Amino acid sequence: PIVEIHLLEGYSDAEKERLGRSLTAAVQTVVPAPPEAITVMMHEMQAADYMRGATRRTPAPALPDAAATVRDFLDTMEARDLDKARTFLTDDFVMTFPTGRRMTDLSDLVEWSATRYRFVTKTYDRFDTAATLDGPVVYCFGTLRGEWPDGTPFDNVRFIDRFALRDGKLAVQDVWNDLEAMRPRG
Amino acid sequence: PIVEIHLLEGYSDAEKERLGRSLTAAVQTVVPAPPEAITVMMHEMQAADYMRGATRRTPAPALPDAAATVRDFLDTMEARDLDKARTFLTDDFVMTFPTGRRMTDLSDLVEWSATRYRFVTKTYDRFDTAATLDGPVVYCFGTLRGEWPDGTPFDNVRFIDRFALRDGKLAVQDVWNDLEAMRPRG
Amino acid sequence: PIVEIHLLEGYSDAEKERLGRSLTAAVQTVVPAPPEAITVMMHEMQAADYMRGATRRTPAPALPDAAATVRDFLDTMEARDLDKARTFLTDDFVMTFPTGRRMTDLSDLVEWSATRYRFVTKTYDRFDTAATLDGPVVYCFGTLRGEWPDGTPFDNVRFIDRFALRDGKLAVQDVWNDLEAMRPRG
Amino acid sequence: PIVEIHLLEGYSDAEKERLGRSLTAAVQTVVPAPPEAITVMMHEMQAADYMRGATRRTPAPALPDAAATVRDFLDTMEARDLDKARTFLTDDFVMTFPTGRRMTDLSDLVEWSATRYRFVTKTYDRFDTAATLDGPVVYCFGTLRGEWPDGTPFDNVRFIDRFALRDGKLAVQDVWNDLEAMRPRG
Amino acid sequence: PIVEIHLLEGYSDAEKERLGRSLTAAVQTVVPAPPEAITVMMHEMQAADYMRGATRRTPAPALPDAAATVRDFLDTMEARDLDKARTFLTDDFVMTFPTGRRMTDLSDLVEWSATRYRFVTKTYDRFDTAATLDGPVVYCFGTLRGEWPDGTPFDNVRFIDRFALRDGKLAVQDVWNDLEAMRPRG
Amino acid sequence: PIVEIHLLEGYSDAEKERLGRSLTAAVQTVVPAPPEAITVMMHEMQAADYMRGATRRTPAPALPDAAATVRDFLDTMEARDLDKARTFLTDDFVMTFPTGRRMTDLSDLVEWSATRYRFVTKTYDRFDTAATLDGPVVYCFGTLRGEWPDGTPFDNVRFIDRFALRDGKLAVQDVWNDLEAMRPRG
């Protein structure tokens, strides 16, 4: 299958590369061709060579790479830099953590987790980006290492995060993980 | 943006529809245009009209709707019809459940889960399909209702499933949920 | 130059003909290439093959030929079949005749016109259709023959009509002619 | 509908805009779509990227905007600069004014009109271009202000002009107006 | 590289296959890509979908396969069916065989060859078709088996034929071979 | 017919010219259209605008003009400059000469031919390049002049060479000629 996309000039090489990869995978959700049977060609237009409604149009500035934004945010939270972390977030950002704990302030999350473990560090197995008609959604999963409250080190505890975005910013975060399934009880 | 895709004739209307929606959404991971500003045009070719390496090509028969395949599998599992559930699976299908329990035989899952709760029933908040270069990956999440082993009822226990597919069959299942986080402890 | 147009299936051959000639002529308003150096290709899409905003589009019916509609209306007026004439008009149709006489009701025109001449019959020299971004606009000019109020015959009195259309119906008529220039004065 | 046009490099942004608008309007003579639903994409080729006959082609230098040419000729005539006015004209230019007065010399028209009014100056309500296969045809209409021969001022006397062009110059002019309909009579 | 060709309906599947292979090969005379990297797509248009100079156009009836025509002529000469062989030929067909012997009558070739060998039968290693703008040119080469005039058998005597064609018919034949280089000498 | 080819930027004007003429000639092997009915359009893509298998292609430099390479090599062999002549050859180059003599060392050809004639020089009637799916194949033919071993001059002895190329180098040479047919015999 051969995909052509006509777009206005001004997107970077890295943005074209994301788009090309995204278009290729889209095809594979229906057509079981190997990526190597799938071609994407991009035709760039200058503003004077494009009109819609008898009117030139302004290119929509590119969204950042949603998976990179999520990783940057999650890195910034591990560095405990809440000021910087907030710059990734919409005004109405909402987090849901295990138990259904719903929170809108990053400080609330620090206090709530403080007693659940001393710290946790993420190892990422995978980032998947789900393209929706409401923009991208990011899933990332892997394992946690850290220490329980009494200091006991743990390791290889599975986690997954889901982020929904709006206009490039993180708008919703949901978290599921295996901490309470691996916590020592007896 | 205008997307054109050239493909061999034979795909159903519903397949073209999924394909067009996936392509539209793929654009939106980079170009934040209103879906109204995004056009998809499909050019259908007869076998005789298309050639690569100087030879006609075989129409690769369409994949099914992966989210619907996942939903049907999970429904069948809830009906405890393991004979049918296995018709969804690759021969090397592997499941990972909370604690990192890695299982390849649905029977193993039944026995392992039997002690952890009497039953669960899934309410689905959302499916998302992540188009990858290895094919579709399906994420679905929502909440569980059921009973703890002592017969105590629960509901609204968060869960998330991830499925990776291969040639229209389910190849990998990973599961994360809030059961151990919500389970009553003396 | 080579013009490609992509459109939904279901236009007749004659409609495709009109569209091809119109596109060719548009090119000739800027590029003084001979018509033979201008190619038009039409790609036809089934509904299933075309999507904007993740939605199939319903194919409209083609507009009638505006110049024929005008001719038909003017013919009906000459036959004095007002009921039929009105079927050609928008509810807000407006006429402007020499002296700037502005009229909305066909019956107003026959009354106003009756004192000006016994009758007029149009010979058409030319129709022209101007493609505008509000729709087609038709111009037709030629000569009138008739009799002045006292019965004196006349012939070859120049006239021109302009019609603006909306959705295939006649929305504005402007009229200009040489009657008063040629009228006998005692 | 999506219109693509392939043309050789060299046309200015303004020429491209004219062409884009003409193609858009052309579509609207058959397909009842709002301009907003109609896209025009231009693909520009360098000489080395284009071949017809195993040989290259030289682009036809663009036509000027016929409506601007007409307006400039008419402005010039209002300034009474007949030397300049003639540079707009084909050698066989022919004029027809109310009464069927057929004229080839601009000085003829000056003499003939001098009897008819002291002066008139045009206010333009609209320009329309009819794209035809023999090149553009220009219609413009509006009103005249001026003075009758005895010095009585008039105002809002309707007029319409039609110009046929040949290779960018004015070849035929036809005029119709309400001057004799509005003239005071005895 | 992606090659697209737009053409009128009416070509057979076999004609399209020849066309696709020739376009692929053409690309390979300049672009050093393997055929598997070269895609050809054909867009077929009904007559109503195509316009040049604002008129429909009639497809040129396809040419026959030049290399098959040659093979058929040569097979016919091996069965010695001269009357049939002359149906492949232009009225001014010319042959040139080793020693420079030029001949226009097939029966002249029969008499000349008679004393050079008892018979010869062609095994074809290859046909190559040279796409020139002045007509097709067919080269074919391989080996001969047969018997010298004294009955002594031979095989693997190399041969090559060149044929120029005109409007589907064989117009020139040139032959070179190793018979005299292999002939036994006293 | 209208051919479009999409390819990476970087081909020279002369390379595009060869490619356009070749595509044109390819069409003409099937569609006997006049060359001015055949247009070729080339669409150039930047590296970042083209993907296959979700990865960009590295453009490989255009092939040289095969018929020129062949001519250069043959001129160099006439000059007896084997060192230079070998720069044109693949490492697995193979020659077949009359009698089926198969040689891989240019030195071998000089020994073998030295006893067959004093020298020959080629007068070329024609080069034909055949576009094949294995790459370009060059045929050139004409006549030889030289001297038999005893010094007796000859001229007008027919010859034909066939070269197959690989990555712009000569990989196979086959030769057929009338030398043994014209040699004086005791």
**Which residue has 């193609």 as its token pair?**
D23
C-alpha distance from F167 to closest chain E C-alpha (Å): 7
CA–CA separation, C149 and C115 (whole Å): 7
- The set of chains that have 3 or more CB pairs under 8 A with B is A, C, D, E
The CA distance from D59 to F65, in Å, is 29
Question: CA-CA-CA-CA torsion for E108, E113, E118, E122, nearest 10 degrees?
Answer: -100
Nearest-CA neighbor of C3 among E77, B174, B166, D24?
D24
Residue entry with tokens 């309909």 = D181
Six-digit token string for F70: 């062949």
Query: Counting Cβ atoms within 10 Å, is residue C161 exposed (0-12), middle (13-18) or buried (19+)?
Result: buried
Which positions ≥6 away from D56 have C-beta within 8 Å? D47, D48, D50
**The tokens of E185 are what?**
């000498």
Query: How far apart (Å, rounded) are the C-alpha atoms in residues A85 and A82?
Result: 5
Listed in order, strand segments (DSSP E) in chain A are 2-8, 39-45, 50-52, 89-97, 101-103, 119-132, 135-147, 153-166, 169-177
* A&B contacts, CB < 8 Å: 205
How many beta-carbon pairs below 8 A join chains A and F? 42
Distance from the C166 Cα atom to the nearest Cα atom in chain B, whole angstroms: 25
| Separation CA F8–CA F10 (nearest Å) | 7
Q: Hunting for tokens 């609330």 — which residue is that?
A: A108
Encode E61-96: b = buried (16+ Cβ within 10 Å), e = exposed: ebbbbbbebbbbbbebbeeeeeeebeebbeeebebb
Cα–Cα distance, D71 to D170 (Å, whole number): 11
Question: d(Cα C110, Cα C80) in Å, to the nearest integer?
Answer: 9
C160 neighbors C125 (Cβ within 8 angstroms): no
Cα–Cα distance for residue pair E11/C97, rounded to 1 Å: 57
Q: Could you tell me if B50 lies within 8 Å of chain E, comparing CB atoms?
A: yes
CA-closest candidate to residue B141, choices B179, B175, B95, B117: B175
Could you state, in order of their start, the residue ranges of all structural domains in chain A? Answer: 2-49, 66-182
- Identify which of F26, F35, F96 has the shortest CB distance to residue E26: F26
CA distance F32 to chain E (A): 6
Among candidates B50, B53, B54 on the partner chain, residue whose Cβ is nearest the Cβ of E41 = B50
Separation between Cα atoms, residue F186 and residue F183, nearest integer Å: 10
Q: What CA–CA distance (Å, rounded) separates E87 from E97?
A: 21
B31 touches chain D (CB under 8 A): no
Beta bridge partners of residue F6, listed in sequence order: E2, F43
What are the chain C neighbours of F39 within 8 Å (beta carbons)? Answer: 2, 39
- Chain-centre distance of CA D4, in angstroms? 26
Closest to B124 (Cα-Cα) out of B175, B71, B82 = B71
Q: How far apart are CA C101 and CA F111, in angstroms?
A: 106
Tokens at B83, concatenated: 């004979």
The Cα–Cα gap between D96 and E44 comes to 49
The residue written with tokens 């594979």 in the block is: A28
> What's the order of all strands across the beta sheet hosting E119-132?
E101-103, E89-97, E169-177, E153-166, E135-147, E119-132
Instruction: Give, for D95, the enclosing helix (H) or strand (E).
Output: strand D89-97
Beta bridge partners of A157: A144
Residue B108 dihedral angles phi and psi, to the nearest 5°: -60, -45
A3, A24 Cβ separation under 8 angstroms: yes
DSSP 8-state code for residue F99: G
SS3 at position C82: helix
Helices (H) and strands (E) in chain F, counts: 5, 9
Burial group, residue D129, by CB count within 10 angstroms (0-12, 13-18, 19+): buried
With beta carbons under 8 A apart, name residues in chain D contacting F25: 54
* B-proximal residues of A, 55-84, CB under 8 Å: 59-63, 66
Residue with tokens 């058929």: E72
> Of all residues in chain B, what percent are helix, strand and coil, respectively (each to 5)?
30, 45, 25
Residue A24's closest chain F neighbor by CA? F54
Resolution (A): 2.0
Q: Which helix (H) or strand (E) holds C28?
A: helix C13-28
A2 touches chain E (CB under 8 A): yes
Question: How near does any CA of chain F get to the CA of C2, in Å?
Answer: 9
- Give the Cβ contact number of residue A36 at 10 Å: 12
Q: Which CATH class is domain E66-182?
A: alpha beta
Using CA coordinates, name the residue in chain B closest to C46.
B42
Is the backbone of residue A27 left (phi > 0), alpha (psi -120 to 50) or beta?
A: alpha
**Consecutive H or E run containing D172:** strand D169-177
Q: What is the DSSP letter of A133?
A: B
Q: Are E138 and E162 in contact (CB under 8 A)?
A: yes
- Which residues of chain B does E16 touch, with a Cβ-Cβ cutoff of 8 Å? 48-49
Q: Is A52 on the interface with D (CB under 8 A)?
A: yes
Q: The tokens of F34 are what?
A: 């006049």
Q: d(Cα F53, Cα B134) in Å, to the nearest integer?
A: 11
Query: A2-49 maps to which CATH number?
Result: 3.30.429.10
Contact D42 A49 (CB under 8 A): yes
A43, B46 Cβ separation under 8 angstroms = no
F101-103 vs F89-97, strand pairing mode: antiparallel
Contact D153, D162 (CB under 8 A): no
Q: How far apart are CA C153 and CA A55, in angstroms?
A: 53
B49 to E43: CB separation less than 8 angstroms, yes or no = yes
**Nearest neighbour of D30 by CB, restricted to C18, C32, C132:** C18
Strand boundaries in chain E, DSSP class E: 2-8, 39-45, 50-52, 89-97, 101-103, 119-132, 135-147, 153-166, 169-177
* Token pair for C155: 């012939």
Phi, psi dihedral angles at E95 (to 5 degrees): -110, 145
Identity of residue C138: V
Token pair of C63 as six digits: 């507009």
Rg of chain D over all Cα atoms, to the nearest angstrom: 21
Cα–Cα distance between C170 and D35 in angstroms, integer? 19
What distance separates the 2 farthest-apart alpha carbons in chain C? 73
**Is residue D153 classed as helix, strand or coil in its secondary structure?**
strand
What is the distance, to the nearest Å, from the Cα of residue C63 to the centroid of all Cα atoms in its chain? 12
Task: Please count the CA atoms within 13 angstroms of the CA of F44 that sit on its side-chain side.
Answer: 14
Distances (CA, A) of E30 to D164, F25, F171: 49, 14, 17
Q: Which residue of C has its CA nearest to B9?
A: C49
Contacts with C2 from chain F: Cβ below 8 Å: 2, 39, 41
The dihedral of CA B71, B76, B80, B83: what is its sign? negative
Backbone angles phi, psi at B54, to 5 degrees: 70, 25
Q: At what angle do helices B13-28 and A13-28 cross, to 10 degrees?
A: 160
DSSP state of E158: E
CA distance C76 to chain D (A): 23
Q: From the CB of residue F15, how many other CB atoms can be counted at a distance below 10 Å?
A: 18
Q: Does F41 touch chain C (CB under 8 A)?
A: yes
The DSSP code for E88 is G
C-alpha E145/C-alpha E155 separation (Å) is: 4
What number of residues does chain D have?
A: 186
Using a CB-CB cut-off of 8 Å, the residues of chain D touching A54 are 20-21, 24-25, 35, 38
Query: Per the structure block, which two tokens stand in for F91?
Result: 């490492």
AA letter at C182: M
Task: Report helix, strand or coil for A181.
Answer: helix
Sequence-distant (6+) residues with CB within 8 A of D64 are D168
> Cα–Cα distance between F159 and F173 in angstroms, integer?
13
Report whether F93 contacts F104 (CB < 8 A).
yes
> Does any CB of chain E come closer than 8 Å to the CB of residue B7?
no
Q: Looking at chain B, list the stretches that DSSP marks H as alpha helix, in order from N- to C-terminal side.
A: 13-28, 66-78, 82-85, 106-114, 179-182
The residue type found at B13 is: D
Nearest CA in chain D to B4: D2
Express the helix, strand and coil content of chain A in percent, nearest 5 each.
30, 45, 30
* D54 to F41: CB separation less than 8 angstroms, yes or no: no
Element (H, E) at B154: strand B153-166
CA distances from C79 to B84, C67, C110, C163 (A): 77, 18, 12, 19
Contact C159/C152 with Cβ under 8 angstroms?
no
In degrees and rounded to multiples of 5, residue D141 shows phi and psi of -145, 160
Neighbours of B93 (CB within 10 A): 20
* A114: DSSP letter: H
DSSP class of D48: G
Give the integer Cα–Cα distance in Å for D69 and D88.
8
* Residues A153, A147 contacting (CB under 8 angstroms): yes
**Kind plus residue range of the DSSP H or E element containing A182:** helix A179-182
Q: What is the DSSP letter of B134?
A: T
Structure tokens at A111: 């206090």
Any B CB within 8 A of E40 CB = yes
Token pair, residue C183, equals: 């009228």
Nearest Cα residue to D93 out of D180, D17, D169, D178 = D169
Continuous H helices in chain E: 13-28, 66-78, 82-85, 106-114, 179-182
d(CA E90, CA E83): 13
Chains in contact with E via at least 3 Cβ–Cβ pairs below 8 Å = A, B, C, F
Question: What DSSP character marks residue E35?
Answer: G
Exposure string for E148-163, b = 16+ CB within 10 A, e = fewer: eeeeeebeebbbbbbb
- Determine the Cα–Cα distance for residues C77 and C140; give it in Å rounded to an integer: 15
Between the two ends of chain C, the Cα-to-Cα distance in Å is 60
Chosen for mutation from C9, C44, C51 (greatest number of chain B CBs closer than 10 Å) is C51
Q: Determine which of A18, A29, A40, A42 to mutate to test the interface with B (most B C-beta atoms within 10 Å).
A: A29
Closest CA to C132 of D15, D63, D27: D27
CA angle F42, F44, F49 (to 5 degrees): 140
Does B6 reach chain E within 8 Å, measured CB to CB? yes
Strands B89-97 and B50-52: unpaired
Measured in whole angstroms, the distance separating CA A14 from the mean position of its chain's CA atoms is 17
Return the CATH number of the domain spanning residue range C2-56. 3.30.429.10
Q: Which of residues 115 through 144 in chain B touch C, CB cutoff 8 A? A: none
Q: Does D41 touch chain B (CB under 8 A)?
A: yes
CA A170, CA A84: separation in Å to the nearest integer? 13
Q: Is C159 exposed, middle or buried (0-12, 13-18, 19+ CB in 10 A)?
A: buried
Q: Where are the alpha helices (DSSP H) in B58-177?
A: 66-78, 82-85, 106-114
Mark out the alpha helices in chain D (DSSP H runs).
13-28, 66-78, 82-86, 106-114, 179-182
Number of residues written out for chain F: 186
Residues of A in contact with F48 (CB under 8 A): 13, 16-17, 42
Residues with Cβ within 8 Å of A45's Cβ and at least 6 positions away in sequence, in order, are A6, A7, A8, A9, D41, D42
End-to-end alpha carbon distance in chain E: 59
Is residue C59 a contact partner of residue B29, using CB atoms and an 8 Å limit? no
- Collect all residues with Cβ–Cβ distance below 8 Å to F77 and sequence separation of at least 6: F85, F106
> What is the Cα–Cα distance from E174 to E176, expressed in whole angstroms?
7
**For residues A176 and B162, what is the distance between their CA atoms, to the nearest angstrom?**
12
CB A103 within 8 Å of CB A95: yes
Let me know: does C159 contact D170? Beta carbons within 8 Å: no
CB F137 within 8 A of CB F151: no
- Give every CB contact of residue F132 below 8 A, 6+ residues apart in sequence: E25, E28, E128
Which chain F residues are Cβ-neighbours of D43 within 8 angstroms?
A: 41, 43
Cross-chain Cβ contact D50/F42 below 8 Å = yes
Distance (Å, whole) CA A145 – CA C87:
80
Query: For residue C87, with 0-12 CB atoms within 10 Å meaning exposed, 13-18 middle and 19 or more buried, which class applies?
Result: exposed
CA E32 to chain centre: 26
Contact partners, residue E181, CB within 8 Å, separation at least 6: F98, F99, F179, F180
Q: What are residue B123's DSSP bridge partners?
A: B143
DSSP string, F52-97: ETTBPPPPPPPPP-HHHHHHHHHHHHHTT-HHHHHTTEEEEEEEEE
Residue type, A57: R
φ/ψ of F150, rounded to 5, equals -80, 5
Closest-CA residue to E176 (of F144, F170, F77, F98): F98
Give me the half-sphere count of Cα atoms (radius 13 Å) on the Cβ side of residue B110: 10
CA distance E132 to E137: 7
Distances from the Cα of E15 to the Cα of B167, E9, F136, angstroms: 35, 12, 22
Sheet containing strand A135-147, strands side by side? A101-103, A89-97, A169-177, A153-166, A135-147, A119-132
- Tokens of residue B56, six digits: 């006609």
* Runs of H (alpha helix) within B1-156: 13-28, 66-78, 82-85, 106-114
Amino acid at A153: P
Cα separation, F106 vs F169, whole angstroms: 15
What's the rounded Cα separation, in Å, for the pair A165 and A130?
11
Report the Cα E163 to chain-centroid distance in Å.
6
DSSP lists the bridge partners of residue F139 as F128, F162
The verdict on a CB contact (< 8 Å) between B53 and E41 is no
Locate D144 and state its tokens.
Answer: 């005249």
Distance CA(F127)–CA(A45), nearest Å, equals: 42
